[PDB]
Amino acid sequence: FLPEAMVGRSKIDEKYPDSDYPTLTDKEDPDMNGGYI
Amino acid sequence: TIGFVYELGHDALKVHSRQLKSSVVISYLGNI
Amino acid sequence: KGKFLVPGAPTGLTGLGTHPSPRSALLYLYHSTLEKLKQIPEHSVYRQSVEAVTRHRLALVESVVPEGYDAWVERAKKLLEEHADQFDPTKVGPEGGEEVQGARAVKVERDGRVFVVSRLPKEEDERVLEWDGEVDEGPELEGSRTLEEKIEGGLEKIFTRRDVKDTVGRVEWEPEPQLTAEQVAELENKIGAGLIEEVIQVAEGELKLVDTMVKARVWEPLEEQPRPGQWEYFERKP
Amino acid sequence: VGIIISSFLFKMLPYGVIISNKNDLFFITSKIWDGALAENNHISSIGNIMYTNYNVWLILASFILLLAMVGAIVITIKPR
Amino acid sequence: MIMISILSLLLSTSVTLRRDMSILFNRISIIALAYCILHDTMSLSFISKGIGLHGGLLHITNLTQIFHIFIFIISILILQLTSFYPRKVWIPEYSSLKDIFFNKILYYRTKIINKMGEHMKIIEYPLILLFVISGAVFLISTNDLVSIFLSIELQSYGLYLLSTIYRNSELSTTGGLIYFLLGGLSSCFILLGTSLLYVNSGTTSLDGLYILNSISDVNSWYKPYYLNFSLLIFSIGFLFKVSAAPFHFWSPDVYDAIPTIVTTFVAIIAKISIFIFLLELVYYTNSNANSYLSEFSWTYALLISSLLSLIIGTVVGLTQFRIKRLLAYSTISHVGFILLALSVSSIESTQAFIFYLIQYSISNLNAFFILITIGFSLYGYVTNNKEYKSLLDKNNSPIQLISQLKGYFYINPLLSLSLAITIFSFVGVPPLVGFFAKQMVLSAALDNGYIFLSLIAIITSVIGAVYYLNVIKEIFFYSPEHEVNPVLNESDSNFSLRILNEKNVLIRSVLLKGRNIFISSPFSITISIITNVILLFIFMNKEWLSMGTILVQILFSA
Amino acid sequence: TTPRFWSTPLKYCRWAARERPALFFSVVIGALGPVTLATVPPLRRLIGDVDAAPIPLTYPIPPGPRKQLKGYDDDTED
Amino acid sequence: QVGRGGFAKAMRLAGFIGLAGGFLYFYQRSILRFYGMSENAREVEMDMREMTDRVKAGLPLYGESRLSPAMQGVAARQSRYSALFFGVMPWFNFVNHNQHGVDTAKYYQQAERELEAERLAREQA
């Protein structure tokens, strides 16, 4: 009944994205420093 | 009965149906 | 009590009420018509007909002067000349102003005659009149708004609109003396086209007809000659 | 949800009602005269007390009806 | 008095359809609630646990009367939003006593004061609010099972109609509809709770059930199992209405959907009245001797709810970007503290419960006032954010987002500090009043062996302090997205104000701009008093704390 | 046109009788009740009209000690 | 900023509500002296005189009632201490009943002493 912007998960997903918390594999970040060359 | 006077006062028991006069007065000063 | 007609009182013809100001209205209507004919060439019989009929009926309406007209017209000049800004259509608009819940008036010119049209705020009962009759434009825009939306809201009206009770730089226009119900009959005996409310509506339709005649150019040569045999019927040779 | 509520509320209900859900019981009734001098009808028995002993419930009841008469009309009235 | 005020106001309302009367009908309602205060003040000269009134149906207690008066003050303060125009024009030329009492100021105020706003055009709004107060106060005084049900309905139905009184808002109709439906489910639990009590005990008197309960406290055919689990069903129906978890889901949606002046009264009054009613029930149903009945106490729902309200309230509030959804989750974590103090039943915890409920109701009201005032201040400000353009019902909820408050300390610093102090008081930071409230409930719980719930609450608060700090971080740490309106401050467009004297004679004409447009005094004074009460509570705590010391002594004496 | 009560109450009561009789005369008939309750009882008792005693709806138990009755004892049965 | 006749309308409501609120205030002030919840030295003595006058007159202390003895009870149990609720629901006692919460012995115990002294004063005359 309530509008999507007011109760929607995807709108929370915009304001708090999962990408704001990086998660790399050891294949790309073996040294745990964000892929620093 | 007070709540009944509320229903009569506001016209809650009224079905509107059908199917206000001139208010523009002109004045004459004549020539300039 | 019975001296004057009551505006909006039914006349005996349905939907036709008593005109708040029949004399000036006919002059306004007649002078306005005598102005629009001037875009017609003088050799048009339509011009000469309307020009003849309107002037004949104009001189009759002038012949019936309300009581005290000379006194009021001398006063009303000293108002228009002293406070022309208040009644100027180029300044207050063609509708007399924006505040409908107070009095309004503009000065209008026809043929060079000067007219002042006034809009007294509509007479309604106290108990069904909200904010003195102010216009409800709806709730002011609140919250986060863009400038354009605030512009479209009417934000420039804070600095131009008037509190109706604010009346110091303005003068209260008193309108023209009216015709005593005896004079209304006497005038309409001269015109001879029914009630004066009937005479008025025929005058205003006469005003609107001029624009259609002008556009069509009804005084120019015949468009379509009838072709041979067009208006032949079953007549026997004489 | 059906069984869990029903099991829980079966104990909440009293012996007076759970009766009659090969040795059955039989209710026995007799007569009195002192309590029969002027037997009232249940509508009169409620009237005997609805307007004196429990008149607060009537006054509160009336306020609920008034709010419904005013509220139900405020939200659905033609706007004019 | 409240009933005479409703009937009298209703007779005047029923012979008018003039929408211009709404402001004056709200101003008369504040006068009416002030008479109710004068009457319940006169009734305060007796010391008693309770006095049965009106055939046993109603009762009066010192606690019952101090709470009606509080409801009456809170109602007067909320009623101010619909009683005075939001904005104002102020000039030094109109600032003396002779000016205010003997001069007049004429100017076009229709747009500046929002004369024709929705909050100013609902004729019946104060009337429906008085009915909710009538139901609230009657519930605190209810002594019978039947009286409880009628009073909670009279309170609830009015909150449904208030939630729906904005009938041209699709957002209020929706919030109203959810609240009516799920509250009707809530009442069916309350009716079942009362119905099982009368059916097993033969009595509608609360005074009779407390007597049966006290006898049954000893240390074979009719063990009184019904009291604890009839009261359990009865209790769940009230945990819905105070929006204690796990029956809380409606309140974020309803509070966010209805207009903010309305959400102020709907999110505060039901809690005061319902919590006071439950307090007397919890005291008179506690088995002092440990017993089989004690193992099944209906009050364990309150601990389970307080436990859940702490976790749910602070955690779900972490990722809320909507300010009204944030305010409601903050309430669910505060009702957990209230519930914890209500479930430990002891002199210290009853003092703590009484103090916490009054302080949170004044603090949550300050939060609402600052919020409402901030969105009336944005009148001379303009923004270019797409999100602030995509919001819905911006007239009914001017401020809907936390981000809309970004840089508010650079637009109005003291109102931003007032909201900072109020928020910091929700956190529980000393020396503000909210710290003292939280400490009093922790002290009581620690004394009575509820060490585990104390540990939950302290860990919970640090989690909830995260989203409180994101609000303040929004106010103080970035720059405003709002700009002064370029035409309201242009040095070319100015309205004319004119000052007249006692008898319609002009004194001085003035030309005024947008910098001469300020918040109306009734809201800035109200925010100012509550802010300073919160700020300086430590120097003014003696009379308020002693008032709760004495009420608890009367309730637990004899 | 229509009068206002507070400006001219009598001209309003005349207008209300003629133009809105069902509503206006409802208020008269209804108000006549509390006028009846305030005037008829005093004048009735004035003229000796006495309200009747309540009729017995439960056995009227006499007050005072029992009368120590002799007679109709078991010996009299035969 | 109300219309032309709205404030006079609001005065009539405010006028009534203050009259109604101020009458409840005045009634509550006197009845508290009867409730023993206000300083009532004057009221006690004028109570002891009025009532002991009623005793020696033989007339009922609280007067006579058209209502039945049980109806009197319901009336006493609806209105006793009922001015403490005036802020919410008003109520006034219009019933002459005998159930007022006080031992009436002091009035009888008093009047006979005024009946003892009256007879003795008549003897020496």
From TrEMBL, chain A:
Region entry Disordered, spans: 17-37
Native species: Chaetomium thermophilum (strain DSM 1495 / CBS 144.50 / IMI 039719)
Protein name: NADH dehydrogenase (Ubiquinone)-like protein
Superkingdom field: Eukaryota
Signal sequence extent: none
TrEMBL record, chain C:
Membrane topology: Peripheral membrane protein
Segments forming a coiled coil: none
Keywords on record: Electron transport, Membrane, Mitochondrion, Mitochondrion inner membrane, Respiratory chain, Transport, Ubiquinone
Keyword Cell inner membrane tagged: no
InterPro entries: NDUFA5
Any GO CC annotation of this UniProt entry: mitochondrial inner membrane
Cell compartment(s), UniProt: Mitochondrion inner membrane
Biological process per Gene Ontology, one example term: respiratory electron transport chain
Superkingdom of the organism of origin: Eukaryota
A Pfam family assignment: ETC_C1_NDUFA5
UniProt family annotation: Belongs to the complex I NDUFA5 subunit family.
PANTHER family: NADH DEHYDROGENASE [UBIQUINONE] 1 ALPHA SUBCOMPLEX SUBUNIT 5 (PTHR12653:SF0), NADH-UBIQUINONE OXIDOREDUCTASE 13 KD-B SUBUNIT (PTHR12653)
Protein name (record): NADH-ubiquinone oxidoreductase-like protein
TrEMBL record, chain D:
Transmembrane segments: 1-18, 54-77
Source domain of life: Eukaryota
Subcellular location: Mitochondrion membrane
Family, similarity comment: Belongs to the complex I subunit 6 family.
Function: Core subunit of the mitochondrial membrane respiratory chain NADH dehydrogenase (Complex I) which catalyzes electron transfer from NADH through the respiratory chain, using ubiquinone as an electron acceptor. Essential for the catalytic activity and assembly of complex I.
Name the UniProt record assigns to this protein: NADH-ubiquinone oxidoreductase chain 6
From TrEMBL, chain G:
Transmembrane recorded as keyword: yes
Keyword Nucleotide-binding (UniProt): no
Signal peptide: none
Keywords: Membrane, Transmembrane, Transmembrane helix, Ubiquinone
NADH-ubiquinone oxidoreductase 21kDa subunit C-terminal fungi domain mapped to chain residues: 48-119
Taxonomy, superkingdom: Eukaryota
Transmembrane feature ranges: 6-27
Name this protein carries in UniProt: NADH-ubiquinone oxidoreductase-like protein
Organism placement in taxonomy: Eukaryota, Fungi, Dikarya, Ascomycota, Pezizomycotina
Residue window of the full protein shown: 65 to 189 of 191
